[PDB]
Amino acid sequence: DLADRFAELERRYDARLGVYVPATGTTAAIEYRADERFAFCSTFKAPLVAAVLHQNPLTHLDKLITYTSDDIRSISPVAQQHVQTGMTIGQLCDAAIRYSDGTAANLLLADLGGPGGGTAAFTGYLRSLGDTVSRLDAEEPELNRDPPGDERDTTTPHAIALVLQQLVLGNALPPDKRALLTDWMARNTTGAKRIRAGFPADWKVIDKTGTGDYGRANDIAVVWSPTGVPYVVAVMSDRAGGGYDAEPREALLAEAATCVAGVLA
Amino acid sequence: DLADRFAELERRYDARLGVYVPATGTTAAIEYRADERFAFCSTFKAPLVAAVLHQNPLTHLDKLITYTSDDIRSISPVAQQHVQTGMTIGQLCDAAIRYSDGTAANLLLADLGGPGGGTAAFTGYLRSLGDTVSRLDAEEPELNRDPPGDERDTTTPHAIALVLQQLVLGNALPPDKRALLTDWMARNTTGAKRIRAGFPADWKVIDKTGTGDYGRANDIAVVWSPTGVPYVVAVMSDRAGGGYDAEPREALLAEAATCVAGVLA
Amino acid sequence: DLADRFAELERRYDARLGVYVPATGTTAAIEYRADERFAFCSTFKAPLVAAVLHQNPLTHLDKLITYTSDDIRSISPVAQQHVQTGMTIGQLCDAAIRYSDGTAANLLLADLGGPGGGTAAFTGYLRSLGDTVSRLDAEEPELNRDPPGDERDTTTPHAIALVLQQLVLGNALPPDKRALLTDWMARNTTGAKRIRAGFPADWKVIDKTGTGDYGRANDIAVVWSPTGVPYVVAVMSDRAGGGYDAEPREALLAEAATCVAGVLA
Amino acid sequence: DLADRFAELERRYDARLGVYVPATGTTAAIEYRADERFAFCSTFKAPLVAAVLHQNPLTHLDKLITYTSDDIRSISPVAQQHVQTGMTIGQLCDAAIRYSDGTAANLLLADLGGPGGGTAAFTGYLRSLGDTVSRLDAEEPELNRDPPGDERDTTTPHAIALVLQQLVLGNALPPDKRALLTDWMARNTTGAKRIRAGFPADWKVIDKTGTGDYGRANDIAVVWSPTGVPYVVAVMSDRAGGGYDAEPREALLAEAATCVAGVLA
């Protein structure tokens, strides 16, 4: 019957919608189009940081990286301002998470090295976490104007949940680094209207958003109940029907979170 | 399956639980022990104010009412301070709602007049709103130490919902007065951890709480969705199992509200 | 010329206003009626907690304290709810700071012992910190209806600043305890509209408010610049002119903080 | 007093600093190097939009403009992506304000027509608003890399304030258009750490930034007090001392705004 409540939101908001919450000690998993493909958008920036955290020691975040005016092809609210000054890996990661800065993302991919501009290195990282399905070829901005049906630059709710789970809750990173990533996500600016707004205030929520064309809108998060019980929530949507220029509806993502909060409480 | 989620909370929290939300233009009502009797506790102070608003002109709120130090039997954080000075009907109502002042309650019942200390007059008022089941017999504090099963000083979730609906949303009161009551409930101090904490912040919530012995804990509220859709939510509980001195669990009330928010979103 | 800006606010808001910030390594202090007496209101609850932290070991916070329904004479949003269950010293302190609970305050004074209900014990504590001027005689609620000119239950901005400085920044408490107090103040609920609202968001602010009759309104705080430079800010006001029933203006407190932020930046 | 506080910031940050706030119904203006020349940087994009709003009817914003890959000389986060699709005047203006897109800027100058690439047409527009000092000669990127002392592509705080005032507050534009421009500025992405960060959150702020070599960093804004009183704030800086390669300090701009907020409150 929760299936039917998601299908309702789908109809109201004129969108296809994908939801995954893994199982726990107590609870059974929650599936809805969980094994269908969706566009990543900016959601892959979460693991990306983790990949950079994984590859290098912890003092590596101090390395300053320089770049040019014509390195800014994507929207980049932080990179734009620090062309003269440059930016350290540390600041790059902060921005990529907290502000969804597109340029930084690309710089960090380059920090991974390897062909594809570091997209292979990163693809490789996901496999280390047992992620077969997710696939990534292009960078920002080009990847977020790929057409519907195209399986390049895509993932499933099921998949990305299990990644985020291993990173945050699992032992995929040392505690010190893990800490950093949570801290960053805990302070995301771009996610107020989506998963955060669907949960009660007494729940703790850390999230990473994704947006694009064809009404594409995603949010992946870890939440803690008022008694500190952790849960992973992958929410993904699109509106490929209204074409390229369709607007995403955060309201959709907020409403679903509320249904989910209901079963989890 | 929502039936099964309430029965779960019941088992977790070792409590009996009553829930009612009336039907709307779209949605069907939500019932769970909705037609079972529970203790009012301090929840009856909401209609009580309405009864005093209903019976008298609007300038009647300026009438000063004096009382003694030994008129303070219940918890009365506001009555305590204004013993020498007295208090106007207006300020009495504010206190009764916003602070759940027990003395004021009794003063207002006396303002209704009639035997029972004004409990019959008040019982009479509810019938004017088509409320058959509800009964009120004693005053504060004595009423909050009635034993389980005793039908004096009781109501059903179903009933009190339909009252609150008529008062707040319906035309049971002139707009000016209606306004006052909503304003007061909007500014309740005593309700943070119950219904308010079960809904997302982007919902508007006005509530009136109740507490007592045998783990008795109630909260009735009107909520607005993020798009201004109103709903009435009656939640009532008790824990007569652990006897007189069983502690109430607000956690229970907050958790249920969350399940409810889930179906309403 | 900052003198003239405070006198302006005074005239606009029809209020007397007291401001103190101590001197630092760099900066000179800020004075305006800093050595004039004002009512404490709920501001004394900050040191009060410190006095209880000072007097007893750290394990003492687990001692559960019981009380009756008629022990709630003041407004007490948390004491209200935990009459059946009781409350530990630890929880009492949290409430007294975070919610300005009036009852708890009085219970804690009783924990200090001595005549005056523990007001002498507490008065004694301030002298240990070299505070000459500050005086405390009555408890809640009686102290909040002292008339203007009455020097009982009063302090100066200068004084209370130097206390708060020693507690938070100075070595007046062991680090562990100090930590607790800061944590509590960092999470004050009652202070959003006063000092907090006069500083830019990139400043860190921890505060403790006070309100009462005769438009009495205070806020004492520690702030950190965006680069972690600490400062102590005492702000106090009243409007004894419009009599007992004069309303306090938080706007006044927020405006002054802004003038202060200006010199500190 | 305040003169000396600006000279301090100057010394701290190793920079020359220009500040202007016009006079109001109440307050006297604020001058500090207000009549000295500074580089525009990207600040001129504000009036530029206004000039295009002024010259043409309101439906002109729908005219699509196409361009080539080799038309993208400057930083252009939006122009980069819409080479295939093209962009309407409407979208061009949004970008120029909200994202400080450098290409769009140049396209719009071309929309004005005339020699200099439309820089004379634009220079001409400012004179219509009674602005004598301001001049513009080159386009992006070339204009941001021309040396200190060179009076081409420059303005004074005094001047640009009086322009922004007339546009936003004054009757320089019809309400409908005026509305558009404010809306755009209200939604600037590039300005978080400058003027916006120096004011308290309860102030409303709309801004337009500028950055360049020789530590050049500007922000012009309209602010509303918490009670809706409007003010215009021009802040400009540079660090020609450390030569071409000197890094700009937004911190400087944020600090000054704080001093200004202080006098305005």
Ligand SMILES: *C(=O)/C=C/N[C@@H](C(=O)O)C(C)(C)S(=O)O
């Ligand atoms: C991540 O969610 C995407 C970042 N930004 C894009 C979006 O649609 O939100 C763009 C297209 C603005 S970016 O220039 O690629």
Ligand SMILES: *C(=O)/C=C/N[C@@H](C(=O)O)C(C)(C)S(=O)O
């Ligand atoms: C409203 O919920 C009831 C308040 N009653 C109190 C009273 O003093 O009458 C108590 C203490 C009996 S109950 O614990 O709320």
Ligand SMILES: *C(=O)/C=C/N[C@@H](C(=O)O)C(C)(C)S(=O)O
């Ligand atoms: C802090 O001590 C202020 C207390 N005074 C008032 C308040 O704001 O709580 C009263 C007078 C309402 S107190 O609770 O009696």
Ligand SMILES: *C(=O)/C=C/N[C@@H](C(=O)O)C(C)(C)S(=O)O
């Ligand atoms: C406007 O001030 C922005 C101009 N863009 C850049 C350019 O390449 O011209 C800079 C370097 C001046 S700015 O640092 O973003």
